[PDB]
Amino acid sequence: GIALGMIETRGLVPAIEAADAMTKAAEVRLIGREFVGGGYVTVLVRGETGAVNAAVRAGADACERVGDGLVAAHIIARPHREVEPAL
Amino acid sequence: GIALGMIETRGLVPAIEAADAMTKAAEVRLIGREFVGGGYVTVLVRGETGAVNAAVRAGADACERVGDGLVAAHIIARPHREVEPAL
Amino acid sequence: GIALGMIETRGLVPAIEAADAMTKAAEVRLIGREFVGGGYVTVLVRGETGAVNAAVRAGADACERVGDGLVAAHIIARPHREVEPAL
Amino acid sequence: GIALGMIETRGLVPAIEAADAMTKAAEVRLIGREFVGGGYVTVLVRGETGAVNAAVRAGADACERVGDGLVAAHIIARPHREVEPAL
Amino acid sequence: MGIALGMIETRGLVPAIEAADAMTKAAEVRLIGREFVGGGYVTVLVRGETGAVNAAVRAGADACERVGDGLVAAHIIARPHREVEPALGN
Amino acid sequence: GIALGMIETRGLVPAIEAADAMTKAAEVRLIGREFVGGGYVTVLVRGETGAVNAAVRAGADACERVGDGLVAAHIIARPHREVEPAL
Amino acid sequence: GIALGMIETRGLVPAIEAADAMTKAAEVRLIGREFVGGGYVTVLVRGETGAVNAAVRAGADACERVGDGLVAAHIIARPHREVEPAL
Amino acid sequence: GIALGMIETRGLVPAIEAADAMTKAAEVRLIGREFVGGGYVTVLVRGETGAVNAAVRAGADACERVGDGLVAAHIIARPHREVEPAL
Amino acid sequence: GIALGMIETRGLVPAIEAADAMTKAAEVRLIGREFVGGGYVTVLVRGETGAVNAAVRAGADACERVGDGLVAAHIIARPHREVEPAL
Amino acid sequence: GIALGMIETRGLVPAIEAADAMTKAAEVRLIGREFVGGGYVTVLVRGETGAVNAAVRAGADACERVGDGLVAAHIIARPHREVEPAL
Amino acid sequence: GIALGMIETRGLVPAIEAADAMTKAAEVRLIGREFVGGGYVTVLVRGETGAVNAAVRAGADACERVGDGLVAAHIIARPHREVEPAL
Amino acid sequence: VMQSITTDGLKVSGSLPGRSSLVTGDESGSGKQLTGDQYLGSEPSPKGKS
């Protein structure tokens, strides 16, 4: 796939929670795990657009109040060829 | 050509979505993705002055409400050559 | 010039545009951009103390509105050699 | 995917901006640009069902405020082999 | 060398021609094409960098809004996708 | 003469009589007779600016009682060379 | 003969009726029939001025009742040499 | 041809914009520019009577509201022999 | 870039500081600094349309209160191929 | 001849109407074209008393309404020799 | 000494007294003595940023009571290499 | 000739590649807070995110 699912939160706990939710809920291959600073942690996964949407929504739903919570999530279907160097 | 465009938020998720908006909005090449620290994240693009304007304007002003939000955006038509090490 | 001028802010966007003010205001050469931590960013420039003062004030005056604003604008006209290994 | 998305609009300008939305929204490939006659222009893309659905949503949402407006917009997810000679 | 797309629509070819004339008098944009949509609709297409495209498209618009039937749609593509022009006719 | 005069009308009766008025009123040379489509007919003549204007005035007043009448009358003096490949 | 007779109508059936009036009203050669676009159809014939006038009057009196019928009907006595390249 | 058009304004900016109007509106040959003094700048262009008139007309229309304004816009069609060495 | 930016003032000091704003704003090369007379002073720049726009606009934002201040900042987007001797 | 005709005005537009009025009114030869400065522009002709009188009358009666207006138009009958080498 | 100080004065007397103040006050070199026209005279000195600051402070405090006084006194510390053609 | 007003209120003109209601495409973001530096006139721009 080419679509990029992606979630980010406070602390690594909800990060791996969203990751486990995505890898269980969609045809998605986890490809990036970023420690951002100040507790911001981002998990970014690659898969088809429908799978990306399903995984993102499932992770966000199962990750709502646990830990310190999400801050956002998004469904990108195609980053440009020049965006993948950022990951 | 050498116009330098800037996007700055807390958490790299609005940053990279502004970056996708950059590479989808105007002919600007992103040349850096920097982790400021404490959760602050920055994307650093290059392109034509009007292109930088269109890109940065659209992306930053569209991704303000994405999660915890963008903090600031800025544009430089010509950085000084001596400011090269920052690149 | 050997005197030091230097700027501190939150997020490097005000830092780099204040460095642009440095290098458009007076004949000063920047030596470094440093991520202090927790969003704190500093810029370090050489110059003669007249140019140092002019540039540093220009950056401070052009820097407060950008992002989170300044944290400290400081100049030293006689930097010791013994300080250089920290630079 | 072989899902076929396709958009009809008032003349060529909304068609081109809709194709822009196609290629910036989700993974689709422009298979056709057709000038029906009498001011009608249609764009034909292929891809995965969910991706094409998101893409055509974005294309419409772009086209309503462009020019004279949208005419018609449909999502065929299973183009029969008998339809292939028509495309 | 500008690849941003400046392209507009007119009812009738008279506004198309005079709007394209203003287009190429108002910026350095290469007139890449004219297309007859059908029923008198004419779309003109030029390539150039974003600022030139913006200025020239604006000028063509406020020149063509009155000529003949008038403008139909004036739009500015800044990032034509790699696949669009082959479907656009290159 | 390099000035380009040109007009629009409904059908060929007004177009041909307008071309005749072009030729009789002023000694200009016709360069194009274009079928825009949907009954839209345009004529494109070449001559010096005064002759262009006079001929176009004569053709313009000679078509309202002819068929459906004139739709778009226009004179320009200096077209850019970029329009020539479209001519 | 160089005199031009030429008629506009809606749909080519009244155009064929007008050409029929041409061919049994006077001995005048037809130069062509053409589909203008949008349903407009133009018939153009050449002949002597009196024969052209009589034929055109006959066609106007004949084809104006069929469907929408005649749209524009007028003659040119001695067309200019610059006009005929359009034919 | 021989017709002389010429535009007077105060400040060089309206002068060059009037000259651009001359050489973009009609086919004329600009023969020169003159710095009169006291802020007075004039552009002298050459061409046929119709082109010169149309050019100066368009230039006056454009140059009314630019900068601090136009002074006098005039047309000469038959410059005398001893008048030319003034140019 | 060939777009010409133009800006006028009264006195050499505002003109030269406007030229500073030119060289510090965007990629604009000053091709001529000429003296109209009567206090009127001219500065030109050449570059891309967007860059020229940003530069001239910044120059205006810089020259407003420099002694006499701004007089005219009107600009163009393309000089004609003939105006070079007039440049 | 020997008589000296002279006319001066604010701006060179009315100066050139003065000059060509000189030439058209009668046969008189021009001897001087003067840019005095501050907007004053002057023209000097040489001819017979009646011819120069008629010429200057025509110029003063023609160019006042043109532009900002005439300011002085004198005529001398017996030009002294001592003024000649000053010219 | 790259910093460029410049003073605009009503006439040559305030200009040269200002230049003398420049040369007596701080270490500068006089590079420019320009006559704008209409009485405006501009003086251009180069030197160290603080040196130029003190010098032109002295000159501005010099020129208020001399004749008609100042018009525009300004300081720029960074003349670009491309500005040299204007210097 | 098109007109505009500078960020400090000054008067500028030219081709001026700004925002106009006749042309679509440049709607996103132009309306909201102005970014650092400056390119767009103090004249307010149409919205219609679209």
UniProtKB/Swiss-Prot annotation, chain E:
GO terms for molecular function: structural constituent of carboxysome shell. Gene3D superfamilies: 3.30.70.1710. Residues 4-89 form the BMC domain. Its main location: other. One of its GO terms (biological process) is photosynthesis. It is found in: Carboxysome. GO terms for cellular component: carboxysome. The keyword Nuclease does not apply. Keywords: Bacterial microcompartment, Carbon dioxide fixation, Carboxysome, Photosynthesis. Homohexamer with a small central pore. A CsoS1-CsoS1D-CsoS2 complex can be isolated following expression in E.coli. Forms a CsoS2-CsoS1-RuBisCO complex. Belongs to the bacterial microcompartments protein family. CsoS1 subfamily. The tight homohexamer forms a small pore which is positively charged. The major shell protein of the carboxysome, a polyhedral inclusion where RuBisCO (ribulose bisphosphate carboxylase, ccbL-ccbS) is sequestered. Assembles into hexamers which make sheets that form the facets of the polyhedral carboxysome. There are estimated to be 538 CsoS1 hexamers per carboxysome; note this number includes the probable carboxysome shell vertex proteins CsoS4A and CsoS4B. This is Major carboxysome shell protein CsoS1. The lineage of its organism: Bacteria, Bacillati, Cyanobacteriota, Cyanophyceae, Synechococcales. The gene is csoS1.
Curated annotation (Swiss-Prot), chain L:
Transmembrane segments: none annotated. M-repeat repeats lie at residues 1-39. It is found in: Carboxysome. Unlike H.neapolitanus and predictions for P.marinus strain MIT 9313, this protein is not thought to have ribosomal frameshifting. Residues 9-50 are annotated as: Disordered. Signal peptide: none annotated. Required for alpha-carboxysome (Cb) assembly, mediates interaction between RuBisCO and the Cb shell. The protein is probably highly flexible. The C-terminal repeats act as the encapsulation signal to target proteins to the Cb; they are necessary and sufficient to target both CsoS2 and foreign proteins to the Cb. The N-terminal repeats of this protein bind simultaneously to both subunits of RuBisCO. Probably also interacts with the major shell proteins (CsoS1); that interaction would increase the local concentration of CsoS2 so that it can condense RuBisCO and full carboxysomes can be formed. Belongs to the CsoS2 family. Has 3 domains; the N-terminal domain has 4 short repeats, the central region has 6 longer repeats. The C-terminal domain has 2 repeats and a highly conserved C-terminal peptide. The C-repeats serve as the encapsulation signal for the alpha-carboxysome, and are able to target foreign proteins to this organelle. Probably interacts with the carboxysome major shell protein CsoS1 via the N-terminal domain. A CsoS1-CsoS1D-CsoS2 complex can be isolated following expression in E.coli. Interacts via its N-terminal repeats with RuBisCO. This is Carboxysome assembly protein CsoS2. The lineage of its organism: Bacteria, Bacillati, Cyanobacteriota, Cyanophyceae, Synechococcales. The chain holds residues 359 to 408 of 765 of the full protein.
